[PDB]
């Protein structure tokens, strides 16, 4: 990494300058999940990159999922699930496990990783200081909308308290659980929650770490892969895409139409993907803008 | 509760005035555990009382344990323990479970209970914003000091950041886990941690909720029960007391000699015990002062 | 007062919690007069209660009258009065005496009483820092409106400066005298002034200490005594009531229609009446709301 | 006043500049009494001059006496006095009258006069916000120190709260009454109180308005009149001077040795004497400095 | 200057009080040029007067020209000029000289003069912190508008940053040079720039130091000289006046119609002219108001 | 610059992280001179790099020289010099030219260049707000110390005001001229001034842009070139080095012994040299530390 001449090291850094200018003093929300969360080297790079942002006076906010870890814990506890369509029903018991895994295990790991660089990270959920509330959602299955227990969407966000938290120099690491209007805690899909936090905080950018190069319109044609797309076009394309690309794309839409200047689908399998997408013009991600 | 004449309701409230004066703008640390934590009616009273303090401009800080809940979860997970003396060894696996139970389950319940009264509670551990660190402890068993894994005492406390957190109008609910100097998270005995937080924050009072009327010098003589005692006297008495009274008493000593004006052993089985001990002269607790 | 079991002392305090929540950080204006001002034990309770409010982070503002004390001083000075209808004419000489008695005697007593609990009280009049101005009033007598000298109503209030004064942690004790637009000081009826200060400061509650159990619609039927009433109903009832109840009722109307959520007519002859009315559901007072 | 050429009007103003520089942002304490207080034209000039100071960003503090007005009121009330030596005994009754006259009459007049120029003046006594306390004094008479009732010297001053009051842009007008350690209000000699306030607030200058051209060492030799003198010299001269010059001179000593850079005895019978002494080199006063 | 009695020194100062009140905490923009800039005694008086304003808590802002000094320097450098009509073309070379003379010579002299009284003055141009921008102007010559190089009018002003600069206690000394939208620095006529700064900063007054007694409507009739005039009247009169009076009059118009309460044409040949015009009713200047 | 794979672009940026952490919120003083100042491409890179620092929340301060430009201007003006030893005597006339060239020409260019990236740069000299003073220096020539006119060293620095200037988000661009204790402006060697500003402001680093690869102990042996050296060693080596390396080395000594953690001699002929030296381990410069 040093057989590389130092006059070229210089230009790489200098080309970061226009993005440092654009993001300085701005909040960036990052949905962190997938492989970028399960592999040790990529995890540490992700944390080091949150430290980078904070040491540039940029204000990152991290929203994390953790579907597979909840499943494993429920299996470890011998808790048998009920399934409507493809969805597990979130009984009170399943929520307790979810909350405990998301907040007490997955969030802790990232807080400690980030904090290796300084006292930056702080874990929270909608429960803490009533930072955000949830409204119960229903999913549509094989035709008909259906109840699947204590699952919801972000309802309201204490935009004010959240931004004080970051002006204090903090990186919030959010576990997507929040109570409803009656104090009953729901679990929120982490992709949609990221989009709701981005819009509530006036984020400059929403980053969505996923396990793919970027959005393919005609998957799997190699050259159907697109670099940038507007919301109107992407909305017309949404009904066609793979099962798992929908949440990451629905999020990018609801954020960008909500006023977030751009959402980005970037490849979480690339070390320092966020540095690459934010401070470099050579990213593999897909950028969503309003249109 | 209203067959009681209203001229007597008045005097009860008026007699709270000298303690409102003394605690106004002061931090009070409360170790919350025992039955006050397992019974539904007593839990809700405890939360309502934290709301009371905060709505008097007093600054409560809650430190909670949860020994029995960790044990149950380890049994649920089929994780076999190792025991030196009376102590379970805290392997990395046991810590993960502990952390997840203390922070992801027990702390959450109190945060939501308190927050029924407003956006006050916020959960944290030494991991968040590096608020406090731990140093590995060893226990003495049948003669010889011995290692029992990832267990420690509070090392350093970010006194500054902690008090900003409460000046913002927050009730911190602390789960006693913190990392050491190398980022390795330890579990800390909640009683000792409360005493360390009280001393670090310049608390005016340290409250220790336990499952007993108060300190008995000659248990179980009914009239060996004492109302107030100095540290020097209590230190000479410590080697004699029941197995479980030691941590609550060691804490009261280390706090009061650390400069905390008084520590109190109060009966967590009494509804609104903290209201009674703080704003009334008719408490059953034991008050420890320096001597 | 201690033959009363301590589990009942607890519940009295706990039932204060919803009113502590509602008044926290709010201004409460209190018109103080009548017997609550002439009896030593009731005076000290009143002061101790202002200290209570301030030590709950509530912001009391006291407005006081003192009709009988002015009369006595004028008699002591051999100053013969002129009377149109039932009203003494407020010559420049009578105003000087009034101002000197209200501000230099009656207000001083309450400032010192309150200040026994801390550096809270501060005496003022509309003259100080131009906090409020007066406009000359005329009274109606046996048919025709008539001039009775330097008597007026509150004109304008420096809402801003007044609230800075209380955010500093102060209890203003107001003597109802203020200058007009030309610097000519008038004496203002203390009941009406309280209502004007309450409305100007966005008070949460207006308390009116009087010498009666509460409002009687058909005095003196014992069960004509009412617990709560709306402004529209009370306005239709106002033309019927005793000579002295009019000012306290006109005040409650003009405050509540001015946007103050409730005004209260409470019995100043009850020790700690304000504690009882504010933090207890067992008050004898009458609550006025908008309707 | 305009037959005077405008190039000379200019130089008068320009010669004020070095004293504007020296006093900018500084507190000046002014003892106001004597004729400067009893004549209408001189009163209005005095008030206009306090407005001048405040509109130069100088921070005046006014301390006033009023001996003759108390005497007249006591005579009006038929309150017979007791006299040890030359001193009236200050019974509780005499204090009430004093307090009421000083605070409720004399202070009010100056507050309104000053306030004709803006919302500047605010009246206070040691009672308000516990701004200062008194300690009972005894006088020496024909040889032996003797008690003369509720008379004292300034004990402690809340320097902090006082300076916040002036940073808010206020002119405090102080009536020299304060409570002792037990809440018992004493009357304080206004000259000595001014000296104590000057020293407590780190005043830059202490002004003493009196009814004389200045200090005469050999009164009444016309040319014994001095322009400046040091404390050591003036202390040796103090035992010789007229009965009434002692308090004004004792004050100047205790202030200047207390660290106040200069005290000044200026002629209150000169219109705008304070403008002349502060912003002009042609004053008749006497300046006391440390030596 | 002291054969003048001190009771008259007093009244001169006291008559300043209503203008101290009106200007306290207000910004006053002063165009400084002409003889008031070339004569040593008048220069020092001008600086001492800026110190005066600042030590009254008034916020002066100085805008300076310097036409003749640029001309001399260009002649010293042997830089031959081109002239369309009466105007020199401002080539890039002429701008560099102008900028260097205005900012590096003329502004420095005033900064040091003022700073003899304290750390007040600070020199700037539109280039510093992008405080203001310029738009290229064209002049009209013998009929047709024509380009004369890098000369412009003030375009936009960072009103916010400018007022922070003065709230810090600073006297900005502005050299009228600023960049356009593309970073190309233009030279701005100092009279027009003063008018633009006055309007942008919400100045209370605009002072224009010139080399004349005041505005003459029928120059040179001695009694055509006017004391005050409205914008509508002065606009109808503008097409008639001497060649050099136009810029000072156009400025006063554009300021006063821009909302500045008054602009003043005052005689820079009078020592302390600004003291005379601001704090005295005996000025020779001409006051422009809206009409 | 893009035939370079994007996984390597990532690592270049990530390796900046430990230096972003170390410099975040810290002041870095940069002496800017030599070729880095005369070539267009290197100038723009230097400005872009100051923008970089400011957009990382680092606080750069620029100190510039300009010896050759003064010489050229004096020649353009036909001002004949006097020379003692190798030094031109700085007559009042030469200072005026120097001041005008340094502040009115050289500083302006950098302010505008930097400001192309935002409203960051602000030009100043010790004259502005009395930010720093000078003391007259004498040089030693062929044996004997000798006067060479208005040349000096930095005397005192208003550390406070300077750091407020940068906390406002500003890049000060300093022209090394300041007045002495009597207001007489001197010209200060820019290298020594940088060292004095670095020490006064508690700079974290002092950067010295020069026209050489780095310090050579045995110039011109190619491998006498050193990467790091302590002050004690460098002090013993100073008497041997080339004529022009002395000021840059004396500066690095006086800074580092003054408590600045490191001074750096870096090659101003390298594009983005400051990015390379600050955020990369591959710099050609020489680092001076205390020893
Ligand atoms: C949300 C909040 O206030 C917070 C927290 O939840 C944890 C640590 C520090 C903090 O300031
Ligand atoms: C109204 C005010 O400012 C004040 C006062 O009138 C008396 C004592 C302290 C104060 O702050
Ligand atoms: C405009 C500014 O910020 C400034 C300056 O240009 C010079 C000295 C101090 C300052 O605050």
Short mmCIF file of N, CA and C and ligand atoms in Angstrom, two decimals, chain E residues 121-124 128-129 131 161 165 168 170, chain F residues 121-124 128-129 131 161 164-165 168 170, ligand 3:
data_model
loop_
_atom_site.label_atom_id
_atom_site.label_comp_id
_atom_site.label_asym_id
_atom_site.label_seq_id
_atom_site.Cartn_x
_atom_site.Cartn_y
_atom_site.Cartn_z
N UNK E 121 -10.22 48.97 16.38
CA UNK E 121 -10.26 48.88 14.93
C UNK E 121 -9.79 47.61 14.27
N UNK E 122 -10.46 47.27 13.19
CA UNK E 122 -10.13 46.11 12.41
C UNK E 122 -10.41 46.43 10.97
N UNK E 123 -9.43 46.22 10.11
CA UNK E 123 -9.59 46.52 8.71
C UNK E 123 -10.10 45.38 7.89
N UNK E 124 -10.95 45.68 6.93
CA UNK E 124 -11.50 44.66 6.10
C UNK E 124 -11.92 45.17 4.75
N UNK E 128 -12.68 39.78 2.72
CA UNK E 128 -12.50 39.04 3.96
C UNK E 128 -13.81 38.39 4.38
N UNK E 129 -13.78 37.07 4.60
CA UNK E 129 -14.95 36.29 5.01
C UNK E 129 -16.16 36.51 4.10
N UNK E 131 -17.51 39.17 3.13
CA UNK E 131 -18.40 40.05 3.88
C UNK E 131 -19.33 40.81 2.95
N UNK E 161 -22.69 38.31 9.72
CA UNK E 161 -21.29 38.31 10.15
C UNK E 161 -20.80 39.71 10.50
N UNK E 165 -19.31 41.00 14.19
CA UNK E 165 -18.03 41.68 14.30
C UNK E 165 -18.13 42.90 15.22
N UNK E 168 -18.79 42.03 19.01
CA UNK E 168 -17.53 41.71 19.68
C UNK E 168 -16.81 42.95 20.21
N UNK E 170 -15.93 45.70 18.13
CA UNK E 170 -14.97 46.09 17.11
C UNK E 170 -15.50 47.26 16.29
N UNK F 121 -11.29 32.74 4.90
CA UNK F 121 -10.16 33.60 5.15
C UNK F 121 -10.41 35.03 5.57
N UNK F 122 -9.54 35.51 6.43
CA UNK F 122 -9.60 36.86 6.92
C UNK F 122 -8.19 37.34 7.13
N UNK F 123 -7.85 38.48 6.55
CA UNK F 123 -6.52 39.00 6.67
C UNK F 123 -6.32 39.92 7.83
N UNK F 124 -5.16 39.84 8.45
CA UNK F 124 -4.88 40.66 9.58
C UNK F 124 -3.41 40.90 9.79
N UNK F 128 -4.40 45.06 13.72
CA UNK F 128 -5.84 44.91 13.85
C UNK F 128 -6.19 44.38 15.24
N UNK F 129 -7.06 45.11 15.94
CA UNK F 129 -7.51 44.75 17.30
C UNK F 129 -6.35 44.50 18.26
N UNK F 131 -3.82 42.67 17.94
CA UNK F 131 -3.73 41.22 18.08
C UNK F 131 -2.34 40.79 18.50
N UNK F 161 -8.30 36.72 21.89
CA UNK F 161 -9.00 37.22 20.70
C UNK F 161 -8.67 36.38 19.46
N UNK F 164 -10.83 33.13 19.61
CA UNK F 164 -12.21 33.47 19.25
C UNK F 164 -12.36 33.60 17.74
N UNK F 165 -11.38 34.24 17.10
CA UNK F 165 -11.44 34.42 15.65
C UNK F 165 -11.52 33.07 14.93
N UNK F 168 -14.88 31.11 15.53
CA UNK F 168 -15.91 31.59 14.62
C UNK F 168 -15.88 30.88 13.26
N UNK F 170 -12.97 30.80 11.21
CA UNK F 170 -12.18 31.64 10.32
C UNK F 170 -10.77 31.09 10.17
C1 LIG G 3 -14.10 39.92 10.35
C2 LIG G 3 -13.40 39.26 11.54
O1 LIG G 3 -13.87 38.28 12.00
C3 LIG G 3 -12.11 39.83 12.16
C4 LIG G 3 -11.10 40.43 11.40
O2 LIG G 3 -11.19 40.55 10.01
C5 LIG G 3 -9.96 40.91 12.04
C6 LIG G 3 -9.81 40.82 13.41
C7 LIG G 3 -10.82 40.23 14.15
C8 LIG G 3 -11.96 39.74 13.53
O3 LIG G 3 -12.96 39.15 14.29
#
